[PDB]
């Protein structure tokens, strides 16, 4: 039963689509997470001064 359940779950996941999705997400964030967070803080300051 456990093997059947794992097989049912694994047929749903497609390596091709999962691979391209994860590749896009990793290229999206690679080396820019700290920059993105600092930008969110900067935008917080900008909005606090603009509103």
């Amino acid at each position: 039963t456990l093997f059947e359940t794992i097989t049912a779950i694994s047929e749903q996941v497609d390596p091709i689509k999962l691979n391209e999705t994860l590749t896009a997400a990793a290229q999206a964030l690679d080396g820019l997470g700290d920059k993105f967070g600092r930008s969110i803080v900067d935008g917080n300051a900008i909005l606090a001064d603009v509103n």
Binding site: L2, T5, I6, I9, V13
Partner: protein, 52 residues
């Protein structure tokens, strides 16, 4: 495979010691396999695979 045993664990590792004929009331037993298999099967079986 198996080969059970019983381990006496003391974090302090010092102080007073047990005397012959005494009893150790504090005990622990492993998590057991059958409940773990049941939990794994039930956790995986509720995921909606078509939604995945």
């Amino acid at each position: 495979v198996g080969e059970q045993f019983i381990d006496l664990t003391s974090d302090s590792g010092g102080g007073a010691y047990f005397q012959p004929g005494d009893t150790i009331t504090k005990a622990t037993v492993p998590a057991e396999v059958g409940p773990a298999l049941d939990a794994a099967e039930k956790g995986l079986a509720v995921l909606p695979k078509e939604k995945i």
